[PDB]
C-alpha cells in the first residue's frame, strides 16, 4: 500500500472533465501520520462542483438542523417555504425530555409556509402575525428562534427588526437567526451563524444577574447534540466524577441552560467544528477556558476523564479514578466478548466534522483498523486533528462524490463501512456491511462507557449478521 492510492485517485479522477479534475484531485490525498497541516497534503471547505452527488447540506441544515432545532423549551420557526421544515421534522435523533406540544416543541415543525404572494410582496408582516399565533397557541414556549431559508435571503426581509419589535412587544426572546441555504459552501456557515446568533440574542442576557452560585466544578457540555442519548451518557460520567454539569448546548438543551454557560468554570467541548467559534467568544468576552475531549470508547473516555480532571483540584482526580475503576470491569468485559469478533475486521468511514476522527479510538479498542475516512464540511484545522489519529497508506476524502467514494469502496474492499442515509444503501447492495454513523442507525448511545457497550455490539450484529453471506444466488 504505497503509491496505489495515487494510482487509485488519478484513476477515479480520470473521468472528471478538466474543470472538476484539477479541483477534486486536491480534496483526496494520502495521509502521512506526520504533517501537522494540510495546506500541503489535502484541501477541504471549498465550493462543491456541480451535479456530483454531494451529501453536503446547506447553511440551514446547520441552523435549524443541528444547532437550534435541539432546544426543547423554544419554538424554532422555519421561516421560508414549506419544504425545509417538513423534511427535517424529527430527522435528527437529538433526544430530550418534556411534554411535546405543551412544554417542548422539538419533534414539531413550525413554518411560515411561504406562498407565491409572500415572496412577491415579501413578508415580515406575515412573520409577525405568526410570532403572535405561537404565543397564543403555545403559551409555554419560552422564546422563538426564526430560522431563515433561501427566499428570505433574496427577498431581503428585515426578520432582524421584527424579532426586536415582536418580542420587545411580547416580552420574549426571539432569535433572528440567518441561515440562508445559498450561504457558505457547506452546512458549516450555519454553525458559525448559529454560534454567533447565540452569543447575541440569548447568551448575553444574564450578565448583570448574580443570583447564581459558581462552584469550582460547574461546567457545561458544549457540542454534544445528544444523538441517541450521548449527552446523557456523558453527563453521567462527569457528574459521577464530582463535576457539576450545568449546561448542555443543543441536546435536551434549555434556553436558560444556555444562558448559564457564562457562569461556569470550564467549557467541555466534544464537537469542535460546531461550537469552537462560540467557545472562544465564551472565553474572550467572559474569560472562561475551554478544552477538547473525546468520549468514544474505553481508552478515549478513560483518558479524557482524567484531562478534564487535571483542570481542577486533586480532590476530583481521586474521585475520577473511582469512576474509571467502576467501569473498568464493564468495558473490559465488552472487549473480551466482541473484540474477538471485530478483530482484524477493517472499517471505512465518512461523516461531517467530528466523528470521522473521533470514532477511530472507539475502534482501536475493538481491534477494527480504520483504512479510510473523510468529512463533508470540515476544514484543515479539522484534518489537523485527523492525520495523527490515522495510519500511513490511509486514503482520505473531503466532500467525496458518488463516483469518488463508490470506486474507493469497490477497491479498498472494506468489511464494514460507516456513513449516512444517502449512502447506507449503495453499499448494502454491494454486500458490504453498513452501519449508519450520523443517526447511529437508530441505536443506543455511543458516547461514554454505557455507550461504548452498545457500539461494540452494534458493529457485531451488522458486520457478522447472516444476511451478507446470502447475496449471490447459488446458480449465480
Amino acid at each position: 500500500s504505497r503509491e496505489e492510492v495515487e494510482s487509485l485517485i488519478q484513476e477515479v479522477l480520470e473521468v472528471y472533465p478538466e474543470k472538476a479534475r484539477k479541483d477534486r484531485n486536491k480534496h483526496l490525498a494520502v495521509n502521512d501520520p506526520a504533517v501537522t497541516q494540510s495546506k500541503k497534503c489535502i484541501i477541504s471547505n471549498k465550493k462543491s462542483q456541480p451535479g456530483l452527488m454531494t451529501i453536503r447540506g446547506c447553511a440551514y441544515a446547520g441552523s435549524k438542523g443541528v444547532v437550534w432545532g435541539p432546544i426543547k423549551d423554544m419554538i424554532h420557526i422555519s421561516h421560508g417555504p414549506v419544504g425545509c421544515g417538513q423534511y427535517s421534522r424529527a430527522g435528527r435523533r437529538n433526544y430530550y425530555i418534556g411534554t411535546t406540544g405543551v412544554n417542548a416543541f422539538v419533534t414539531m415543525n413550525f413554518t411560515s409556509d411561504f406562498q407565491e404572494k409572500d415572496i412577491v410582496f415579501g413578508g415580515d408582516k406575515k412573520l409577525a402575525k405568526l410570532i403572535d399565533e405561537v404565543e397564543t397557541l403555545f403559551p409555554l414556549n419560552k422564546g422563538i428562534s426564526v430560522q431563515s431559508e433561501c427566499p428570505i435571503g433574496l427577498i431581503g426581509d428585515d426578520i432582524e427588526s421584527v424579532s426586536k419589535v415582536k418580542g420587545a412587544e411580547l416580552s420574549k426572546t426571539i432569535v433572528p437567526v440567518r441561515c440562508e441555504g445559498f450561504r457558505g459552501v457547506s452546512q458549516s456557515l450555519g454553525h458559525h451563524i448559529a454560534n454567533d446568533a447565540v452569543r447575541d440574542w440569548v447568551l448575553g442576557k444574564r450578565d448583570e444577574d448574580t443570583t447564581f452560585a459558581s462552584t469550582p466544578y460547574d461546567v457545561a457540555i458544549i457540542g454534544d447534540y445528544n444523538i441517541g442519548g450521548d449527552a446523557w451518557s456523558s453527563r453521567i460520567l462527569l457528574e459521577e466524577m464530582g463535576l457539576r454539569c450545568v449546561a448542555q448546548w443543543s441536546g435536551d438543551g434549555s434556553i436558560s441552560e444556555i444562558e448559564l454557560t457564562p457562569k461556569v468554570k470550564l467549557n467541555l467541548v466534544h464537537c469542535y467544528r460546531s461550537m469552537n467559534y462560540i467557545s472562544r467568544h465564551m472565553e474572550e468576552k467572559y474569560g472562561i477556558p475551554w478544552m477538547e475531549y473525546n468520549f468514544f470508547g474505553p481508552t478515549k473516555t478513560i483518558e479524557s476523564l482524567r484531562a478534564i480532571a487535571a483542570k481542577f483540584d486533586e480532590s476530583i482526580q481521586k474521585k475520577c479514578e473511582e469512576v474509571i475503576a467502576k467501569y473498568k470491569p464493564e468495558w473490559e468485559a465488552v472487549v473480551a466478548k466482541y473484540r474477538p469478533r471485530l478483530e482484524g475486521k477493517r472499517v471505512m468511514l465518512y461523516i461531517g466534522g467530528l466523528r470521522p476522527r473521533h470514532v477511530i479510538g472507539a475502534y482501536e479498542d475493538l481491534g477494527m483498523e480504520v483504512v479510510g475516512t473523510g468529512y463533508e464540511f470540515a476544514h484543515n484545522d479539522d484534518y489537523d486533528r485527523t492525520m495523527k489519529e490515522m495510519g500511513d497508506s490511509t486514503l482520505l476524502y473531503d466532500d467525496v462524490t458518488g463516483y469518488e467514494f463508490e470506486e474507493f469502496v469497490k477497491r479498498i474492499k472494506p468489511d464494514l463501512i460507516g456513513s449516512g442515509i444517502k449512502e447506507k444503501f449503495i453499499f448494502q447492495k454491494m454486500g458490504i456491511p453498513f452501519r449508519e454513523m450520523h443517526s447511529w442507525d437508530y441505536s443506543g448511545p455511543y458516547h461514554g462507557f454505557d455507550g461504548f457497550a452498545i457500539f461494540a455490539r452494534d458493529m457485531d450484529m451488522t458486520l457478522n449478521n447472516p444476511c451478507w453471506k446470502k447475496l449471490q444466488a447459488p446458480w449465480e
Partner: protein, 267 residues
C-alpha cells in the same frame, strides 16, 4: 401574432412611446395587448384612463393565491380595443418585483390570454435589474425587442448595457433586437449619433421621436397623444413608429460595444 418587448433606461420614455405606438397600432385596426411588466403600474394608465386599475399581483393578493384569479379581473379593454394588464408589484424597499413579472406573465399565458385574439402583444418592461425582468424575452414570449434611447452618455450606456444582456437570451433563444427608438432629449447631433450606435450595435434606429410637449398635455390629461390630438405633429410621428415596426423585418443579434468605443462615439 407578434410579441415585442420594449426596453430602456427608465426615465427616457418607455410607456408613452409604447402606449402611443399601440394607440397608433390600434388606429390601424390591430388587435393589441399591453402587458405591464413594471412595478410602477402606469404602462396602461394612458390607454385605459386613470391612475391604474386592479393589477394581477395586487389582485391575486386578495384571492390569497394567483391560481385563484381570473383573466377577467386584470384584463381590461381600453382605447381602440386595446387590451391591458399589469404585472403589479410591491412598494419601494420590500418584496420582489422581479417575481411579479414572472407570476404575472406565467398567469396570462397560463390562463390563455394569448390564444385567440391579438396581432401585437407589447411587454412594457421596467428596469432590467434581474432574472425576473427578462421574463418577457424567453421562448414564446417576445421575439422582437425595441430598446428605447436618447443622445445622453448614460442613455446609450444603457441601450448598450441592455442589448448586452440580450445576447444571453438571443443566442440560446430566438428573441432579437429589432432596433432602437430615439426620444430626442434634444441633445446635440443626437440624431445621427444614435444611428451611429445602432450600427456599432448591429441594429437599426427604427425611428426618431421628437420632444413635443403634446405628450404632457396628454399624459396629465390621462390619455395618449393619438386620442388627445390625432393630427398633432407628434401624433403622426407615433404613427410612423407604428408603421415602421409593423413592416420591420430586421431583427438581429446585438453586438455590445465597450465603454471605450462608446465614449469614443460621443467624443
Amino acid at each position: 401574432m407578434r410579441q415585442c418587448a420594449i426596453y430602456g433606461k427608465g426615465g427616457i420614455g418607455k410607456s408613452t412611446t409604447t402606449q402611443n405606438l399601440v394607440a397608433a397600432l390600434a388606429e390601424m385596426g390591430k388587435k393589441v395587448m399591453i402587458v405591464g411588466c413594471d412595478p410602477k403600474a402606469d404602462s396602461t394608465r394612458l390607454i385605459l384612463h386613470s391612475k391604474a386599475q386592479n393589477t394581477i399581483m395586487e389582485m391575486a393578493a386578495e384571492a390569497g393565491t394567483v391560481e385563484d384569479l381570473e383573466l377577467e379581473d386584470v384584463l381590461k379593454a381600453g382605447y381602440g380595443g386595446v387590451k391591458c394588464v399589469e404585472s403589479g408589484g410591491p412598494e419601494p424597499g420590500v418584496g420582489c418585483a422581479g417575481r411579479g413579472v414572472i407570476t404575472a406573465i406565467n398567469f396570462l399565458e397560463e390562463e390563455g390570454a394569448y390564444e385567440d385574439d391579438l396581432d401585437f402583444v407589447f411587454y412594457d418592461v421596467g428596469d432590467v435589474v434581474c432574472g425576473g425582468f427578462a421574463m418577457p424575452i424567453r421562448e414564446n414570449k417576445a421575439q422582437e425587442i425595441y430598446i428605447v434611447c436618447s443622445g445622453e452618455m448614460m442613455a446609450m450606456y444603457a441601450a448598450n448595457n441592455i442589448s448586452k444582456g440580450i445576447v444571453k437570451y438571443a443566442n440560446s433563444g430566438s428573441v432579437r433586437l429589432g432596433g432602437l427608438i430615439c426620444n430626442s432629449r434634444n441633445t446635440d447631433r443626437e440624431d445621427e449619433l444614435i444611428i451611429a450606435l445602432a450600427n456599432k450595435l448591429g441594429t437599426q434606429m427604427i425611428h426618431f421621436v421628437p420632444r413635443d410637449n403634446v405628450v404632457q398635455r396628454a399624459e396629465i390629461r390621462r390619455m395618449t397623444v393619438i386620442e388627445y390630438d390625432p393630427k398633432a405633429k407628434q401624433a403622426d410621428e407615433y404613427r410612423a413608429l407604428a408603421r415602421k415596426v409593423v413592416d420591420n423585418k430586421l431583427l438581429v443579434i446585438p453586438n455590445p460595444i465597450t465603454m471605450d468605443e462608446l465614449e469614443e462615439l460621443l467624443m
